[PDB]
Subunit: 484 residues, 4 copies
């Protein structure tokens, strides 16, 4: 009665040779949507052998023709916005608006990758010496592996396979065993777009699959997006196996609010960056360092706004806050709230109260008087928990943000040019936002995090993704002028 | 009965204020398809005003949004390939195979342009001095004027308006008076794609409209694609009016055939480059300099292949060669064929014979023993008339081609590395082709012509079109580190 | 007694075949320094033919070898800063501090140009179609013509010949007949740097030489930097002759001082921009639009600082304001002050009072209460005359600057990010400065002006200069995979 | 008295705290040139602390100024080519001609690095959404560690520290313990060029120092150039320590000779690429796959010139082949020759005979009838030992070359464009040479190796080095237009 998902390998949906399956539920109602197979390394090998085979011909299809397919894909995605958004909500929990928002950014990724022909151009010189010319070209590297998180069932995957495939590589994706349904739709639409068999492969699962991706010698590159501990493991293991990898990991993003900040706009951006998507965002505002002069009014206006948050099913309109992903995560959050109180942090808003039990719901929570000594500051909670800290000025704010081991993003609310430059010059984070709650850059820019937030050389998206998914060859040739 | 075409201004089809209309006939059957208005300056003035007005809002639409529309446009264009090709054949005459080929390249222009976000990116430096940062940006210039020829009813217009619009400008297109229908379809499809009013304007006509575009102060840039005389004039008048302009003009492309050439491939290619589309292409092969050693065998296969060429209505299966555009062009050609004989050229193949009269037909013709002193060599016949010349070696071939006033394209059929380099380094033409009949570079490359074939600095297409349709603003800022 | 200057053609100093000569004096003492020949179209023909000949070998010296000579040049220049600055002061007037400043900028140009190898790189693709590859390359165009002004005897020329030479072209420079000594030194040092004969030619003179440059078919490109009337003239004439040209012309740069401006820095910056180098600068501040609130305090501080300006001989340390270039410019300036008083403007500082007669000295003068209807606002005084206007806000300020036909540079003094963005998006000028008196961008950025300040497509410096001094050839080739 | 070299930390030569010193001998005379310290952890710790401290001010020095110093450095280096070449020759063994060549290459690296300003430029967009702009910037990462091999005492180091320092980083270089003298001069010359203290540091030593670079937290990036085994270890340990690393390792470059090859040019190029610098070159030709047709004639010609090779002291004129680096290398090579004969290879040229004993000399050796199953083909001998293989066609040669574990460079001697494209499209090596023995690409191109020849994503040199020694921060800002 509960549909068992199948893997997509070499052009068709095949069943896994596994006896292990996992229930994927709707975070808001605990209803079982389907069953996800915990594929075996046996499935990963077949998928790898397949991708390596399809690579031989796909890589020979000229980039202009491949780009064409990305255009088709781009259009099919747009036509299915309502469906994709629906799948993201019932599976991830975020409401329709935020879900619809994810679909849009994932499409932007396809749009950016559709311009692959120009993105692949190498350098060329007519003469570097008498009768000698030189030019280098870009080539795909073979089969690429991708590992996706549950917080973005569509967007993160779109960061990887559209661009990698457009550049000539074949792909093996391991979506999040918690949010697999969306990827199933991507496959369908990418097949409709005209993508040939074995070019885009999907193997559902967990650890076995991951290790198979790390261990298989056919998979020359790895793009991992997820938690710090797992991403750090993937980076090391992958390097041990002598293959390039990029791991976009955890975050503990800080937002700096200065005295001259426009409170109206600020409070709204912050409430959304901290509580939207149940705070399950690598770009979620985890800590706010507000300047003394505006601190009092900020907390007053922050509480007011936070009091109007409707908690419920992401499908219902009026709903702002959905549920955390799993039961396990709800407990970890309540534990963190408990930990905060124990460490001396002051509860300004308690999300442990007035929450439905229909789903894994947790109301917004905000702590006051927190320090860099506390666990709720050092750890990425990844739930509706915002910590607030009063600072003397921009300098102290940055010292606190920089003290965090994570450096994904940071925000600054102000209209002061000098404050902005200083912020950008001394802040450790790599994805900065001025007067914006979520500092996530658009697809044509690399998603540049730093420190414990990023392991590797080249980030995802932007021209970085292009170079990470290709390798270069340089040709220096001597062609002596003929005699007549 | 006969539909009268209308102008497209401010998002709507409007009757020209003119009382003069021009019949648009099918070159292959002499029948009237419709009438195009010979619009007045009053019309061009209104278009400029509304285009200048639309520019105020359209330029304020972020490039990612404008680009999304180009993706829709790209799709609509693909779902109408057949209709578009049909239309091109009807008013131009080329068979549906070549027509289908033109529409594909026009779509490629849109595809290239859809990547406007990255193409527009300027340069940014965090510190050029202590406390000082600097960066430059690209902005649209305003209203762009475009004037297109008849040999490419879709492609040429697509080199212009999609990019200029994507980059943020508003456009006024004056298509060829002889092939107006295609442009009508573009307008309609771009409207369905979602382009707001006043951004894409079309004013049909001739001189009054062209001079209107050249004189009107609101039209900042002019893209002209046509004959050398007209283009030389547009460049000069445009420049006198102090506006930037690019004139892609006439050609007399030369094809070099060396002894090691692959006869089979070479002949098929040259036959296509010289007689496809009735030789009415800026990239058409006009002169061929064959190396002495392979000349005899070359001529044998060429004439053998030319004998298989079937002439007729482009819509009919089996038809290779179609009609020339107007009755006046048929006469000009027959006159050239005469001057050839009159100058000593040996008419090896006569195209004045076995030519139906249902349309303006002219069979493929080829002259022998032609020299650089003949009008047959110095002028662009722009019809199905090929001239051949026996040369001693690559060097003499290049000297002959370089002697030509034009320098649009040139081809070399060989497998010798040294010849190829020597060729590229010494030939004057900017668009080179090795073992290909038509050296037309793809959209993402600038259409680099030279000499009397190009007047200006930046060519059409490629990144050249990005800078031509855009201007820069650089900002050097000093933001002292605040006092703490 | 008075040394006559020669021209530098084909690596040799040859005397001009002219009877007419010109006195070149020291603006500060009327002391005659030497005699400049008003060369004839005969001299230019010699230069052009010489430059075209040498272009055959120079364009064949691989760019890496050419760049090496630029490095040597860069060093020689650096070793002669004192000498070069001495010449600039002696013939132009500006003090040694500003003169030293000019040599530094001129060396930056040489440094940027020394990176020509990477700047010339074109685009390459291994496969655009099965078995087909495509790449484009840049090549010099031939002999380039440079026409420089008197306000930057060293820098402006350095915007031209260094980059043009490095890219493969040969050069014919026509420095200002008013400041020709500096060029004499640049020629020597470039010769010592290792530059071969005929690559860098210098022809002193005026109209005859200009028209020779414009009319000679051998001179394929013209870079002009001077007044608007002449530039507008050279742009048209050059275009009539069908050659690419770029004219960087006159300016009436506006500076906006908002209420949050740091007056300390603002005043000092404006004083130096308005009166430095006798206001004889294309980046000089001719108009200040001050916000009403801080207007009075600004005027008291500006008036105070300006009255302290020391006028004298540029070599003399302690001297801020030097002399105006000629005697006419002195009279014309006096005439402008007189015009201002007549038009209703109010004097705050009378430049007519207390001024030596040893040289063409004019004290700094400042008007207030001027309007967009006064000749004092419409014309480029190009002398130490500064007009200020009180405005309600940033919006009114921008409207005023935008009303000028000139749009070279514009500056804004504020710390408000919203004001800064608004300024950049709506201002017409192309060279903007935030909290800087002179918005002159560094050599690696195009020197982008707009409207009556620039004529053409590509500006001087930056990658713009690279494209302006080169042309491209795209090569699309088909090399079928052999059978074995 | 033998001179003891010191370390260079904080702009000062300071004695190592170690008591372990290593003799540096002239490979050609066995004479002890000096003693190099085997530094301790304290020493690297000290350098790391110093470098990190200097980084705080060096990174704040705008790139245009930092580049100025690179121009000085470039000049100083050029005015010491002799002294530099001499040091290379007595320290490494290569004749002064090849030494002078290395000096030039190294100087090119500095020439390329001097263009840091433009190379560092990021992307900037005026509007990505209404009232929202975005742009990213490049910043140095901190302290960079470099480890160089003995075969290029100057060039390899110049691939690293010059660019790193120009990009704003600080550097800690560990040169080869066998060729420390060259580095000493680079340090001294860079100091004279004006480099501030702590920016360029040198710590001589072996394992303690290397492991210090790997383990120290202040060293964010590591550049390793050496053998596959050591490099593989550096990559893994480095990655394990969460720092980015690039390992340029061993090679077994093949050179393909087709029937249409030019024996004269080919043979010369191959003799130089196989026996130049005693074959101790990552770009040296280790295997030649000759086409049957020309095989015999090739071998005969190769014999002639190989026999004309003069062996001796690098400083002596007429000397072509110098000594191998050390005794072990001589023994390892002799041992390889033994294994060759032992495996079935025909010793066509024995370099064990007629070899002086003044230094570690080994005459040119060439094997025949070698196979993919032989040790002499699978291992990098890194000495003057050539292996030849007769193959039927290009395809088989590529299959053999691709079978090698290495893929640094590959050469192809032909004039057939079809073979050339096939070669580039199917060969595994990343640095290809057409009609050139040493396919080493110029500094402005990334030194792109592959397979077991490179570990990481970004190679050394080119724009790859710019991205490897740098990190990005993107800034998306919302600045609402103010209200007027
Ligand atoms: N290099 C290129 O990119 C390119 C591409 C296509 C065609 N062409 C050239 O175009 C020509 C064929 O096209 P065509 O016959 O339509 O060219 P044309 O110059 O006769 O007409 C082209 C445009 O110019 C306008 N025009 C013609 N005469 C005019 C006049 N006296 N005053 C003002 N406007 C005038 C027309 O209305 C038309 O829109 C050939 O010479 C061909 O080589 C060049
Ligand atoms: N925007 C820029 O890049 C820039 C930089 C420097 C100076 N300028 C402008 O230059 C002007 C000051 O320089 P200037 O006084 O030497 O300018 P100018 O126009 O008088 O002379 C500049 C060059 O033009 C030539 N020239 C002058 N009149 C001519 C005529 N009638 N016919 C032919 N050639 C003629 C001169 O010999 C000189 O080499 C100012 O208007 C200033 O704004 C612009």
């Amino acid at each position: 009665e509960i549909r068992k998902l199948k893997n997509y390998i070499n052009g068709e949906w095949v069943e896994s040779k596994t006896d292990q399956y996992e229930d994927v539920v709707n975070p808001a109602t605990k209803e079982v949507l389907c069953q996800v197979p915990i594929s075996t390394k046996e499935d990963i090998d077949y998928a790898a052998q397949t991708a390596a085979e399809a690579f031989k011909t796909w890589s020979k299809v000229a980039v202009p023709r491949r780009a064409r397919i990305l255009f088709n894909f781009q259009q099919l995605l747009s036509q299915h916005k309502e469906e994709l958004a629906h799948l993201i909500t019932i599976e991830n929990g975020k409401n329709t608006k935020e879900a619809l928002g994810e679909v849009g950014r994932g499409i932007e990724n396809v749009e950016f990758a559709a311009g692959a022909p120009s993105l692949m151009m190498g350098d060329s010189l007519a003469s570097i010496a008498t009768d000698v010319e030189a030019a280098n070209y870009r080539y795909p590297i073979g089969v690429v592996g991708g590992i996706a998180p549950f917080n973005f069932p569509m967007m993160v995957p779109c960061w990887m396979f559209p661009m990698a495939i457009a550049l000539g590589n074949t792909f093996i994706l391991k979506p999040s065993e918690r949010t697999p349904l969306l990827t199933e739709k991507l496959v369908e639409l990418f097949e409709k777009a005209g993508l040939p068999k074995g070019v885009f492969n999907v193997v559902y699962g967990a650890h076995d699959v991951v290790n198979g991706i790390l261990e298989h010698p056919e998979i020359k590159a790895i793009s991992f997006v997820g938690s710090k501990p797992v991403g750090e493991y993937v980076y090391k293991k992958g390097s041990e196996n002598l293959k390039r990898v990029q791991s976009l990991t955890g975050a503990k993003n800080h937002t700096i609010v200065l005295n001259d900040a426009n409170l109206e706009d600020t409070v709204t951006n912050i409430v959304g960056a901290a509580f939207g998507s149940a705070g399950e965002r690598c770009m979620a505002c985890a800590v706010v360092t507000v300047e003394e002069g505006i601190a009092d009014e900020f907390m007053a206006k922050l509480q007011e706004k936070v009091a109007d948050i409707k908690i419920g099913n992401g499908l219902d309109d009026g709903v702002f806050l959905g549920p955390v992903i799993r039961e396990d995560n709800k407990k970890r959050t309540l534990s963190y709230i408990e930990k905060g109180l124990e460490e001396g942090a002051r509860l300004v808003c308690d999300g442990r109260e007035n929450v439905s039990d229909d789903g894994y719901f947790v109301g917004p929570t905000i702590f006051d008087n927190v320090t860099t000594e506390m666990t709720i500051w050092k750890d990425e909670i990844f739930a509706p928990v915002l910590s607030v800290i009063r600072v003397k000025n921009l300098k102290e704010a940055i010292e606190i943000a920089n003290k965090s081991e994570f450096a994904n993003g940071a925000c600054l609310f102000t209209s002061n040019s000098n404050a902005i430059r200083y912020f950008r010059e001394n802040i450790d984070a790599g994805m900065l936002g001025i007067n914006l709650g979520v500092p996530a850059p658009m697809a044509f820019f690399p998603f540049s995090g730093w420190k414990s937030s990023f392991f590797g050389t080249l980030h995802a998206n932007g021209k970085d993704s292009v170079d990470f998914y290709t390798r270069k060859k340089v040709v220096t040739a001597r062609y002596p002028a003929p005699d007549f």
